Amino acid sequence: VKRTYQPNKRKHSKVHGFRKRMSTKNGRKVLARRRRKGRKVLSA
Amino acid sequence: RDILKRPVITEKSSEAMAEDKYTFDVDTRVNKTQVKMAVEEIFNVKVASVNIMNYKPKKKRMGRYQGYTNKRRKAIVTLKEGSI
Amino acid sequence: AIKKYKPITNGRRNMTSLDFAEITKTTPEKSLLKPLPKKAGRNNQGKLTVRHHGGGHKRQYRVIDFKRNKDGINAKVDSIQYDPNRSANIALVVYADGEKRYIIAPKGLEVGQIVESGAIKVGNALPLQNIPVGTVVHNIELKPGKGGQIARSAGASAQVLGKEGKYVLIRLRSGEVRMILSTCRATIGQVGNLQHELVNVGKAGRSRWKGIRPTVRGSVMNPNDHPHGGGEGRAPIGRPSPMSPWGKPTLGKKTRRGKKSSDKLIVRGR
RNA sequence: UGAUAUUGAAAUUGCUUUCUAACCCGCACCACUUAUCGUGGUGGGAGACAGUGUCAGGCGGGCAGUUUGA
RNA sequence: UGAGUAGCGAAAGACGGGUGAGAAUCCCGUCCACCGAUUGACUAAGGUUUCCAGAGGAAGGCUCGUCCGCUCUGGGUUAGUCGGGUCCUAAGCUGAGGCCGACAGGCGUAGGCGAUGGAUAACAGGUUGAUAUUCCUGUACCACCUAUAAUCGUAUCGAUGGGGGGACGCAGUAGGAUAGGCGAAGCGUGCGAUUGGAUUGCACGUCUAAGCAGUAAGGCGCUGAGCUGUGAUGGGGAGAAGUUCGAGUCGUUGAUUUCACACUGCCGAGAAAAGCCUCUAGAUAGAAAAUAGGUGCCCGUACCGCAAACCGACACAGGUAGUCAAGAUGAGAAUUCUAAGGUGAGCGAGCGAACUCUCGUUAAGGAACUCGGCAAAAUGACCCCGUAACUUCGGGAGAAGGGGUGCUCUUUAGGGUUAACGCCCAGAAGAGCCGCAGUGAAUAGGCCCAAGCGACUGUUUAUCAAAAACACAGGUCUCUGCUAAACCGUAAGGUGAUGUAUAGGGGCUGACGCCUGCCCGGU
RNA sequence: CUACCCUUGGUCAGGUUGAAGUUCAGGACUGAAUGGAGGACCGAACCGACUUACGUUGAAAAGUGAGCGGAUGAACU
């Protein structure tokens, strides 16, 4: 059976990367809210 | 300049020594042209060519806790005149 | 004319293609083609806003001129051709001092014609203030200098009725009687490729490689998908009127806002 | 669908006609500029109408909250 | 607790010798078996150091383990030409100005990013435990820099501008050529002890890019053209011989490769931009053919990659794009046995109880079973005859129903290739020999008579429903005159459509034949 | 993942039948050849999931065995 995660570096960085979070008001909210918690990895 | 950091002394390094080829670990941001002028400035030798390769950092433990080594840059200069 | 097919399977049984012996050359003129990617019923927002579009063969847009602007220079019909994206055929007309253009070919066209404010025979394109009453024209403008819009399909035509001082009265193919401003050009004749009406596409596959997807009837949808909704077993309409998918009376009701500025121009209905 | 602001000028009779400067044009041409965008000008069309604002009546399971006793 | 219970994840191992505290399992070896349009070779993604060597055996490994994709210590990835960037553009994304909008922001023009496509200069052999068009040897080509340059001069450079080209679908055969395959000549070894034989028996039979020509065909005296021959090459590989030596042939078959989207047919009418070549704008002003040298950046490159290393929590019968793809049998990439190369399944040893599962056979009967011939049997290949109703004239039709098939030897019109000889593909007929049986295994339609539904091919409830449901070609009614109607959005902007009533949206019906009656109370 | 779409690609052993058209002979039409159409036919790769068996603290949170359907297209990828 074909499962739901089919890894892809290009897609992963295009849809969850840093530059794609820094492009929205809400992506910036996401990164700020991960820094409030103090995560090690911000983006993916 | 001091872009050259270390000589490599391995089994394969010494093996290629016979072919008159020398290996160095250089800084992670240089060409193979800066390596060329650097070696020719330091050792006063004529360089025939220079290969270059990057190595990943590989994860090493030595204890409770994990972590990578350093990414390193392995240049290989083939001399034309002189040695070392 | 249409050419029958013998019933050798179930799917060419009742199916007629169109014969193409009014076509001269099969490859187009490279200087005039344009890419034309399929925006399959999706708008700029990416959403499907017109149903039943999608798929189909590739297309290369031919730059047809409907302006028909020239300083009374001659032309000459090189060759009729096929245009994948309109019912009518097109004709490569070369001009006297060496220009290439595409006209919509009216029926009976190989001669070589002109454009001007006053010549008239089939092919020419002149202003409606130089056309006598009873003539049939095609590819009429509506605003002076925009190209023609009306009577432009395959088998279309429009008679010039009488004339006002500033307007001329056209009878459209839908029975529409209208005033059109008397400086809007029009081409003489009828639009060829008249057999297009009679073709029988003959199979669901042939409908499907013209960019037409299956039209599901609203009566078999669920109640949240269509006003004709569900109901155990087949149910009738069960409403006072039929409704569109979006809750609009879809039969009989006049839905004409238009622009409410042609109303001083539209004499008759249809 | 009305009233009223943008909104003017003349006539017969609030109704009706005409006309240009407003407003408007997914009309043409020119310049920005080796841009089917936009802005400006010029020609043309429409024209105090449309579009828009505020008030009002109507239709309105298209969508919404709900009720549907013991 | 259940309980020393179920399970230990499809399958063939055996033995000898080692190593060792300890061996069914680790190493070696011989034999045996399994895959072989793949369990082999190479790659994209993805993983991310698992790759290699020397040590280790507390944990992981469904048992063991001296072993390991595990632990420790050291190592390993080499590019002017390979795949990306310093080239080009699709969809899409972003978009200064700009338009729209409670703010946030949406949209969008010039422009830019964006490969899965276009363009673009290197091949053969050797090598190490780990790289390999990268290192090394041999022979090349490309861009730029430099000096000498025979022959300087509107000769050079030419736009980001103009033009041509690039530049394109789908099917169908026909042809050329080559790869590969097969068979006999030249070499190279062995020549037998079980009856026999020595005309016997195995294994090999060449090789690049580039540069010189010139070449089926094709297109318009031009443009492109597979290919072949030559040197490259006194070089390298080479079964095998003793650092020194060693053959490299004609015959036939031939692709799914390539000429090549070529030619032809069709209708559904089949990307863009640059590199490229031109022309002048316009810089007013070198040599490219040659001689010699020189520089050439970044990123990836290890290993697995139908898998124990990727996605499934697992060392999981599942899923995973593309490339190469041999012999005998054949239409064939089918079936069966093998090649190349690779594997023997990470629990075993007994005994051969019930019972369950997979598989085989069965006297007489032959659906008597059951809700139902469900399951299993049967038929099945190629050549031959023969073939109903009905029908939209195509079909039904592989209708149904029957016959033949092995080996040998004779005669004997055949086909292709060749200067013939010689190979290659097809038979007729006749005479015989055998058996229970001759497509002797494997692979491979049961059929017929009727009724109902749907015309048909197709789609559907991922994970209990594949149908009579949906779609469909066709019919019809209805709206819409173009800034069309309809839909998305608050609007801008869009789609409809770079379309324009033979068109576009919506409702119902659903091939085709014949038909489609009455009513406007009411909504 | 999945449903539809857009752009750009790739895959689909083999064999059978024989539409128009055409040309030849006849006399609009006949027969012979040639041609090679089709959501044509049989059938592997590939894509499905009809039937039954097994499995159901599974090898697998949907699989396997035997058969089965499409297989140049409204195909698959």
From Swiss-Prot, chain A:
PANTHER family: LARGE RIBOSOMAL SUBUNIT PROTEIN BL34M, MITOCHONDRIAL RIBOSOMAL PROTEIN 34 FAMILY MEMBER. This is Large ribosomal subunit protein bL34. It comes from the Bacteria. The keyword Ribonucleoprotein applies. GO terms for molecular function: structural constituent of ribosome. NCBIfam families: rpmH_bact. Belongs to the bacterial ribosomal protein bL34 family. Keywords: Ribonucleoprotein, Ribosomal protein. The keyword Cell cycle does not apply. PROSITE patterns: RIBOSOMAL_L34. The lineage of its organism: Bacteria, Bacillati, Bacillota, Bacilli, Bacillales. Residues 1-44 are annotated as: Disordered. Pfam families: Ribosomal_L34. One of its GO terms (cellular component) is ribosome. The gene is rpmH. One of its GO terms (biological process) is translation.
